[PDB]
Symmetry: D2
Subunit: 115 residues, 4 copies
Amino acid sequence: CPLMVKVLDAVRGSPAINVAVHVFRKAADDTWEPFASGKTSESGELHGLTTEEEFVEGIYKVEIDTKSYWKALGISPFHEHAEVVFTANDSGPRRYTIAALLSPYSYSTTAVVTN
Amino acid sequence: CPLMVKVLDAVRGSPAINVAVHVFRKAADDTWEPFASGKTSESGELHGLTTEEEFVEGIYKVEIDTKSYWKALGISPFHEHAEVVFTANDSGPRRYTIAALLSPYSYSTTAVVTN
Amino acid sequence: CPLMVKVLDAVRGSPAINVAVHVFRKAADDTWEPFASGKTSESGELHGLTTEEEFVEGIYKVEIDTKSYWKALGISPFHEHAEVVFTANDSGPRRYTIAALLSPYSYSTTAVVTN
Amino acid sequence: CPLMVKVLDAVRGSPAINVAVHVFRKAADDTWEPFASGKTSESGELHGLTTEEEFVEGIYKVEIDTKSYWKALGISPFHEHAEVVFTANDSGPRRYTIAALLSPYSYSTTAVVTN
Ligand SMILES: O=S(=O)(O)c1cccc2cccc(Nc3ccccc3)c12
Ligand SMILES: O=S(=O)(O)c1cccc2cccc(Nc3ccccc3)c12
Ligand SMILES: O=S(=O)(O)c1cccc2cccc(Nc3ccccc3)c12
Ligand SMILES: O=S(=O)(O)c1cccc2cccc(Nc3ccccc3)c12
């Protein structure tokens, strides 16, 4: 599993559960092509988006539907979604964990790249 | 000034100077149309992107070109850029300050909205 | 003004107003001695804590009373307070801006140091 | 395991390994009494600090020696250490994960409280 997404709720101090995540890969004509999607689990995690074979070098975009999450909690948010755009590899494939720390008017995003 | 962007370097503890910023607005046909652009000053701030008249209701994307910034400092960062996507002025005109806190493998973004 | 504190509310996207701040300095006997205190203004900022003359070299602790802030807004937060502990002026006098970004179960803190 | 600490390096996008962590419990006379300590593992995690039996309600302080971490990497940091001060329980015991996201001049800290 080369790509994992994790989402935290900073208001409740909990995993952000059932958050939709859409992954896109940048095509040769500079457009965003749908690549993978899912929703975070009870632990706020999303695994099995892709495989090592399919996760080739290139620019990827991870969109996290933060607005719908806050809407379900009855809390007015600022952002439409959180966006994480990055180049897969320098490098030689390894494991990418993208984490998103959510607040209604702020978010932090981190990348842990491990062997 | 209804839209301001501020960028901080969390490695040096200093304003992030000369950071390129591109702003887009979502058109009726669902495409991102160029809206405004500029670079942060010596104080890490970018003003004068737009006017109250031109800053109508809509969905805006603020793209902060973080990769270029880090590379010039000799750092190969994770993200291509920081993205901040939000609905603006849907309850009348407001003033928006978008701040970004930059690390090579992480960023935080905040919004302060005033009436 | 060599020491400034700024506090942001990440739930409301606004300055955190009337937040109590206590500053301490480490004495030669290793105890924390009261150095200065105040509360953030309507802009979320606290100035005039000290002077260049009184702000000598040493280890300082800035205690930001975040729990009291959240409770008044009807929120039971995780942290008692945010702490920021740092050596100051060990390479000559500097100006320090300490910022805190507050969420109920998370905070970020930054420092901008200028000569 | 009622108390877990996790430390991330935001410059390298990696677990922060071999970071010293000291835990204190607030005594009746308002002093900090040493309670538990350790160093983060290769995964940047510290488990087995305490037991459910010993981890009674009260105020705790988790000190993360961030300065020594950056020093070993040859990077000049701002903070002496990161401090996380919190009340264990409202509530009825459960699991506390304290995470710290480290940059040389900034840190974020989060709490995930789970059943
Ligand atoms: O690791 S934990 O805090 O246990 C954690 C537990 C459960 C869900 C999480 C979701 C996103 C990030 C986390 N960690 C995190 C926190 C701060 C910065 C980066 C990642 C989550
Ligand atoms: O405010 S200051 O630290 O003075 C600051 C000074 C200079 C440049 C800054 C750029 C972006 C954000 C800041 N503040 C900030 C810090 C944390 C959260 C949100 C905004 C900047
Ligand atoms: O700069 S602004 O967002 O205008 C801002 C406006 C009003 C109050 C603020 C309080 C603390 C930090 C800020 N900025 C900040 C944001 C991110 C990182 C560091 C500092 C505040
Ligand atoms: O969960 S991961 O990113 O995989 C992660 C992996 C390895 C070490 C980590 C250390 C601290 C926080 C993490 N997460 C985190 C990130 C952002 C906010 C809160 C916690 C760590």
